Amino acid sequence: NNMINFPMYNGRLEPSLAPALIAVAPIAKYLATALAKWAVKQGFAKLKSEIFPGNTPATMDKVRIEVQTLLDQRLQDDRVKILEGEYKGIIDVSKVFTDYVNQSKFETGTANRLFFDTSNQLISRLPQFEIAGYEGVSISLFTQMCTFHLGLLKDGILAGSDWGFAPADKDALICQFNRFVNEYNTRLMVLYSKEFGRLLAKNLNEALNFRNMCSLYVFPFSEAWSLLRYEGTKLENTLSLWNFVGESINNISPNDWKGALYKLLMGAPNQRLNNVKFNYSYFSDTQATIHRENIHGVLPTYNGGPTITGWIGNGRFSGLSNELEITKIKQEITYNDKIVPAATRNEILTATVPTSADPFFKTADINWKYFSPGLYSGWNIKFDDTVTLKSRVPSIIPSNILKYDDYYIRAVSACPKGVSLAYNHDFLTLTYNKLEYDAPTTQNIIVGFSPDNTKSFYRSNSHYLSTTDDAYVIPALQFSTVSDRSFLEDTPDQATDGSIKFTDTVLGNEAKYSIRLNTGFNTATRYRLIIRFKAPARLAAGIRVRSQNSGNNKLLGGIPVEGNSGWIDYITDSFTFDDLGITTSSTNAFFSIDSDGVNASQQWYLSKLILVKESSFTTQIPLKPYVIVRCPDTFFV
Amino acid sequence: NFPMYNGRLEPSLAPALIAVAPIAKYLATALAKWAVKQGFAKLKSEIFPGNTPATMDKVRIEVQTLLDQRLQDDRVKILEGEYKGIIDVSKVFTDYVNQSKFETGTANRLFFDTSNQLISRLPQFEIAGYEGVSISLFTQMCTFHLGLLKDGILAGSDWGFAPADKDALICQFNRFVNEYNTRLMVLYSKEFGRLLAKNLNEALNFRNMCSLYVFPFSEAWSLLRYEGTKLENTLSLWNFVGESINNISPNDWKGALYKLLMGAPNQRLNNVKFNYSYFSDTQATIHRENIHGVLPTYNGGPTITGWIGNGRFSGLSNELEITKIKQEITYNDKVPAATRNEILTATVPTSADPFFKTADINWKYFSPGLYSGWNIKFDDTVTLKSRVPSIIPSNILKYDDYYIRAVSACPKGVSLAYNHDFLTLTYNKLEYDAPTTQNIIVGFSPDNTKSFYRSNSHYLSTTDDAYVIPALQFSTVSDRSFLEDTPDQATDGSIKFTDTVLGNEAKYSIRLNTGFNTATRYRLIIRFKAPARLAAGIRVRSQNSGNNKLLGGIPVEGNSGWIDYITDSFTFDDLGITTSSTNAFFSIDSDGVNASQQWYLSKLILVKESSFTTQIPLKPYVIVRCPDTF
């Protein structure tokens, strides 16, 4: 890698495939239309023509090679043969079923029989796509197969007696859909946890590369599964992608990732970057043979609070007034003729985001290069077309472009080097405590790319609603204010940059979300709010959803919380923005979520709010059967 | 050498025994329930007992002993003449209207003789060059006149006032209740500002005198128009120990120093740290100790505290936190021989009464200047016994019926004019970096504040007719909020709200003591100052476990004075608040404000509907406006 003189793209010799042109993008685009309006008895067939176009495994082959290329991991030749057999089997049985139900006349009893052939084919074959020791590659294949099965079950339930389903048989399908949509999520996160955890210990750069793959090929579909029981929601992905430059880092635990590092990468989650600072040192010897540059710290400053950001690493000058803040010190030293430094430079470098209608960095050219045997080693730092640092190493350091089409640079951070990440987890919060981590150095820079769909919030700090939108998603991290003793929780299966964990035991727990109405908004249209939250223990006073507008506060819903280990979707009663007194000129309007103080066992999570029009939204698959009193067992009959 | 009491050889008079104490006690009674046509006469018996200036003489000598200031012999004789004139004319009036039968027209003329006597003699107590002593005497003569005016208004035709004459007295009351406040603050500001430039310890000693002899009565003026409120003083007393500080400006006091003294204004002290240095030369003749920093840590947020001064070790791993370092150095006879740098910690005991009561803190410079050291002791726990060979005398810091709420210092060697905009109640670290302090400041809060600072909650008793919530005794507060020194409110200060975008709010936690009658009708008095108009006004709410009620929407048209807003009646049943409620709040919120709209919150007063009345209105009854001149 050090002998090769190639322009590089995120540490690779070739530019990566744009996120919008990946093999699974047409499947995600179809699911977005299906989740907004489900085509009854056609939903599964149209999904099948995207997963298995022309009754071929061609798309699942294109997914495998794209993923193998990105991970630089490969399945065994014989395992590929096996998966070909399993695809052929699923295609054979599913073509028979869809050929039958697309005749103008068919027998409902036969359609019922061929449906279950397809369903039990997927139940028995699925474990072939949970491939032990190759979870990184197989998680993207397993994702699509679970998606295929869940789309089949949904279409069968809405089909009813048209495909020979009696009321009691329609109830048995609802019982399986509700069971599988949780079990598949569990079995998905089993694969992700193993591989992410294994790579956190091996190489942080490789771990971020795997999480980036899952952000595009996996987590958009787990979110689609959680929305599949509905019609008239919006499929949205706000996961960020992370690129790593610098010396290797390893031996990170998942607890290290969740407790510290991920909070350190996210900085102020509800704000765009303002400027990032680098603690730079340069060193040259008397003989002009040694030229070494080091980055000892990164200090990202975001557009506002309530999060407080400090040094990751340190901002100290070593090797040289404490109450004075030194930004730069040069030193030239001459010695008696008969490794000692001749020139040293210590500087705080600043990269400032431009103030314009588009206050974001798009691309970056950051690289670190070690020239054997170790005399030269230096850094280039460049955002967009602005050079922050050109290496004072005499030889030229190759370009290392960081970019993703339809993404922009939201965060710049680093991983502390030379210290354990197991400390201060309880005091790395969204407010009050300084989000920092002291280390002797970093010798790495991490860049966070957020998708262009988030540009409107991070530019304005408000959620602008258009009357032409059937649905809008408010991710929990895009808040205006949040209560103390609140944490950022990594919940990637939600296809967001995370959830808010509330832990305050005394005063109470609340997050506010600024909303605006775009001009021409119809304040008479009836809306609903979906609140997704996990609360594993009973709250006596439950969780309150409110609108606040310039002293006019409405209670939109009191959520009864009896305690559940899973994610819950509370749907409010219908309302209009006329009910709330909000207009296209309101400027202090918020949605708010609040609970009382919570003990250790009562600490709960807020994922997102979904605003839907009443006229287009329906629960198509219920949490409980209609007729039968209990779901059957998976036990003996 | 001799033991000292707050830097003096003789102990100071206990706060409960000062000459104005009986006057304050009567005003507390009369503010709960006014005696119609007797209020002025009973107040006269407290200010001029037995028709003598004996109490006003006692006040003068007490305050003179406290400030080490004295009126000239000639000015003393003049005041005796003034007191005689006021007493004689006040006694004639009170004797005549206490007869079985009197003529209303004659009572009317004797009233104006008394009222116009005070108006023409009052400026004799705004003594130029002696405002320090004269402020306490001016305070009582203003109290005397406002008492007479209120009784004139309630007597009406009984003392010969036609409805139009009654309105003119209401016009005079409303003018003078503000004008006397302004003329008081002019005296206070001149003397406080003069002493800040001279000597900070001497300046805090003046504010302490005003917190007992002056500011309780300015608060009493603001409650005199009502009946059924509570008169309360929550001002802290401040004691200074260390090297002299001078050339402080009043702007530095409000903008920085006072905020540093108050620390977390809604919390009790948990621990305080001291940055200590000890130096001893080769000859064992020089022993010097210095205090370079004070770091007070309070019970909780939302305030974040930092070093006042610094926590650095001078004269010696920037990643590791060193708490102590000793050095013994031997040179070649042919400079330091022993040095100690240490972070000392005084920790408040964790008990049913988690407060220091007293302190013994002293700094002594032994001329020629070889010895100089510190003693630091809270209660019976010694934090530092000076390593100077000679014993440093005792310096007892205590106030009967007060306890230690805050420990802080004044930054030495730096200008106090910086970062005023970023010294906030929240978000920003409440610190001020300086090379040293060489002083320690102790804040004593009165025992009436113990309940709140112990529990972080306002417990309400069913047997009490009124309860005062000082603004600084909050649970949570919005960002871009400031502590505002407002000693005329008889509290340790107000909240200033300056957030431009998100909003300004403050919550106060309330609990109900067992046996609380939840069916009793109550009202809330909200004292605020909003100089400019607010389109969405100021909202007052109750919050309880999700149940949130609006208690009042205040219209803010804009006014430069302190405005009291009185909410509509309500029961705790209406709010769903019980004796088992633990999440009950009173809340005050407004929208974002620009620079002109920035407003202040002084206090909330909870009053029973049955015993509360506005006896003196803010506008006349019959005449449309207060009389113009030309």
Author numbering:
A (entry chain A): 12 to 331, 336 to 353, 360 to 658
B (entry chain B): 16 to 331, 336 to 353, 361 to 656
Please, what does the article write about this entry?
Our MR-phase 2.4 Å resolution map reveals two Cry11Ba molecules in the asymmetric unit. All residues are visible except for the N-terminus (residues M1-I11), two loops (residues S332-C335, and G354-S359) and the C-terminal extension (residues S659-K724). The lack of order in this extension is not surprising given the low complexity of its sequence. We note that the buried surface area (BSA) at the tetramerization interface is 33% lower in Cry11Ba, pointing to higher flexibility; this hypothesis is supported by the absence of interpretable electron density for residues at the N-terminus (332–335) and C-terminus (354–359) of the βpin in the Cry11Ba structure. Cry11Ba crystals assemble from tetrameric building blocks analogous to those in Cry11Aa crystals, as judged by the similarity of their crystal packing patterns. We assign crystal packing forces to two types: those that associate monomers into dimers and tetramers and those that assemble tetramers into a crystal. The BSA which associates monomers into a dimer (interface #1) is 38% lower than the homologous interface in Cry11Aa (1009 Å2 Fig. 2e; vs. 1631 Å2), explaining PISA’s failure to identify the tetramer. Moreover, the emphasis on lattice-forming associations (rather than associations within a tetramer unit) could explain the larger crystal size achieved by Cry11Ba.
Cry11Aa and Cry11Ba are the two most potent toxins produced by mosquitocidal Bacillus thuringiensis subsp. israelensis and jegathesan, respectively. Cyt1Aa, Cry11Aa, and co-crystallized Cry4Aa and Cry4Ba. These are produced during sporulation and are remarkably stable in a variety of conditions, but dissolve after ingestion under the high alkaline pH levels characteristic of the larval mosquito midgut. Solubilized protoxins are activated by insect gut proteases enabling binding to gut cell membranes, subsequent oligomerization, and ultimately gut cell lysis leading to larval death. Cry11Aa and Cry11Ba structures maintain the three-domain organization characteristic of Cry δ-endotoxins.
